[PDB]
Structure 1
Amino acid sequence: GTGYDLSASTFSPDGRVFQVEYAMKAVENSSTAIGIRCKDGVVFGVEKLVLSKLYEEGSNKRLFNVDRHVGMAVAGLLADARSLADIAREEASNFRSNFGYNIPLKHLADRVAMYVHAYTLYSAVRPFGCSFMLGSYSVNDGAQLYMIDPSGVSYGYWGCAIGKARQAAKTEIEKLQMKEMTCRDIVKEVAKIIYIVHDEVKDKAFELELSWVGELTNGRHEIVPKDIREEAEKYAKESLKEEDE
């Protein structure tokens, strides 16, 4: 082996810590989670993989509610993802307890990024093996969407995609006028993009998990209703047939 890739506290003779890169490799092996920031909201879509017909519907949710007004879409080791969701929930709770108002998403992203960097600093713990996205909307700050990765970088975004099909998802997102779309249509676009990037002969089973947080929810993140998800799924299948034609 390299000899410098054990422990996240060792710099290779290039300035590279390889444990963080291996964590990034681990996240770049999972299902695809995308998120698009429309003008009046943010929509997360995830192509959850039903790994067995035994699991009930809604098992292994990769869309968490990290505080009432903020949604989280994870991609990678789901155990680490749940732990990070708990960490972010605790950070938002502490913010609301101390300062007395809903945590700004920029600040929440920075806090969780600092936590992930804490775990990538040391040799007694391994870097978090998952990426995730934090989305929210409020009247006084506007729709926001951030992405955090195992190395702990918290760049903002207009459209993001993490997982196996990230490059294809970004390519299919660039061809969208997100800055002037509304939630009711960006949800359908999210479903279409997820269906296009999904691989049927490799991943077999599939379930689309959608959520939005936007003006039409009063800044309250929630799972997209049943009828809306059904209509978006129907539109995505029709669009798949159209693209095939």
Structure 2
Amino acid sequence: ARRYDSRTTTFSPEGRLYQVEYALEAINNASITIGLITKDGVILGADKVFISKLIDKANNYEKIYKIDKHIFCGVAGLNADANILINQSRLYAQRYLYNYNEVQPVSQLVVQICDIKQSYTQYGGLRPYGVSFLIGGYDTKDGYQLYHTDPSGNYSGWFATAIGTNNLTASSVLKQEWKNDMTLEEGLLLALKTLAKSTDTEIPKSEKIELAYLTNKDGEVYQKYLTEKEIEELIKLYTQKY
């Protein structure tokens, strides 16, 4: 039966892990997911992949997910693998709350999920998870945070970043336009700009945009998942400003 083993967790002649490279190719083939930090909160935006006009576009976010009250993620890659890992990370946040009676710092949650991914790359004979996460949140220790994870269990903090297809264009737009002290509105307009420019267009379309942000206001951390109407308002504002 060894003749059927594909040897997923085996080093390649160049110290590379081929399954991880292929999972990264799959992630690079997914729709764009962006994130950026303002002084008013973390913004996550995403392009929706069209399937049919019959999909139920009401209260159906499929690329941005709530992990906890103070944490939320964007997904790039295989959606079912992402669903598994999102369930796991929700469990991890609640476990930290159970054990310590306080909400989990964002970096600790990112570390736990990235450990899951690394373990799949090192132990066993199973394929890795084909998902990259943009995890953003707030906690008193480190303020507003934004992280990027890849299948290898790697991660890193960012002030703005993009994953998925054509992340180069979106990243260049963010590098040119992201500033160190932006307001929520400015952040949302910049997110709309980078989404529009990565999708090869000029005016973005509400039907294809998921936008959410996470603010710590008056002491409560609160997450807003913009509807098609709010996104339409922002699209009008963007077409005014450009």
| TM score, norm. by length of structure 1 | 0.87
Contact 1:40 1:137 in 2 (8 A): no
- What SS is found at the alignment partner of 1:211? strand
Provide closer, same or farther for how the CA distance between residues 57 and 225 of structure 1 changes in structure 2, counting only shifts above 3 A.
closer
Contact 2:162 2:171 in 1 (8 A): yes
Q: CA deviation at 1:154?
A: 1.5
Contact 2:207 2:228 in 1 (8 A): no
Task: Name the % identity.
Answer: 32
Contact 1:132 1:148 in 2 (8 A): yes
Match of 1:220 in 2: 222
Match of 1:156 in 2: 157
Q: CA deviation at 1:140?
A: 4.5
Contact 2:33 2:162 in 1 (8 A): yes
Q: CA deviation at 1:158?
A: 0.5
User: Which consecutive unaligned segments of at least 5 residues does structure 1 have?
Assistant: none
Q: CA deviation at 1:227?
A: 5.0
Task: Kindly provide the CA deviation profile for residues 188-244 of structure 1, in whole angstroms up to 9, marking residues without a partner as x.
Answer: 1111210121136xxx995111110123483222313565422222234556xx5xx
Question: For structure 1, which segment, 169-178 or 65-74, has the greater mean C-alpha deviation from structure 2 after superposition?
Answer: 169-178
Task: Kindly provide the CA deviation profile for residues 27-73 of structure 1, in whole angstroms up to 9, marking residues without a partner as x.
Answer: 01010000001123110000011211121105461110001111110
Q: Separation in 1 of the partners of 2:32 and 2:178?
A: 21
Match of 1:172 in 2: 173
- What SS is found at the alignment partner of 1:220? strand
Contact 1:36 1:178 in 2 (8 A): no
Q: Separation in 1 of the partners of 2:85 and 2:54?
A: 27
Match of 2:10 in 1: 10
Q: Separation in 1 of the partners of 2:15 and 2:125?
A: 20
Contact 1:144 1:156 in 2 (8 A): yes
Counterparts of 1:75-86 in structure 2 under 5 Å?
Answer: 75-86=76-87
Q: CA deviation at 1:133?
A: 0.8
Task: Kindly provide the CA deviation profile for residues 62-108 of structure 1, in whole angstroms up to 9, marking residues without a partner as x.
Answer: 11000111111001111111111101101101111111111000111
Q: Are residues 1:105 and 2:106 paired?
A: yes
- What SS is found at the alignment partner of 2:171? helix
User: Which consecutive unaligned segments of at least 5 residues does structure 2 have?
Assistant: none
Task: Kindly provide the CA deviation profile for residues 104-147 of structure 1, in whole angstroms up to 9, marking residues without a partner as x.
Answer: 00111111110111111235311111101111124443110001
CA RMSD after TM alignment: 2.2
Q: Are residues 1:118 and 2:119 paired?
A: yes
Match of 2:129 in 1: 128
The amino acid of 1:195's aligned partner reads: A
Match of 1:62 in 2: 63
The amino acid of 2:14's aligned partner reads: D
Provide closer, same or farther for how the CA distance between residues 206 and 127 of structure 1 changes in structure 2, counting only shifts above 3 A.
farther
Q: Separation in 2 of the partners of 1:62 and 1:184?
A: 21
- What SS is found at the alignment partner of 2:222? coil
Contact 1:42 1:213 in 2 (8 A): yes
The amino acid of 1:125's aligned partner reads: L
Counterparts of 1:11-26 in structure 2 under 5 Å?
Answer: 11-26=11-26
| TM score, norm. by length of structure 2 | 0.88
Contact 1:49 1:206 in 2 (8 A): no
Q: Separation in 2 of the partners of 1:53 and 1:193?
A: 25
- What SS is found at the alignment partner of 1:53? coil
Match of 2:97 in 1: 96
Match of 2:231 in 1: 229
Q: Are residues 1:188 and 2:189 paired?
A: yes
The amino acid of 1:231's aligned partner reads: E
Q: CA deviation at 1:12?
A: 1.1
Contact 1:178 1:186 in 2 (8 A): no
Provide closer, same or farther for how the CA distance between residues 147 and 31 of structure 1 changes in structure 2, counting only shifts above 3 A.
same
The amino acid of 2:170's aligned partner reads: A
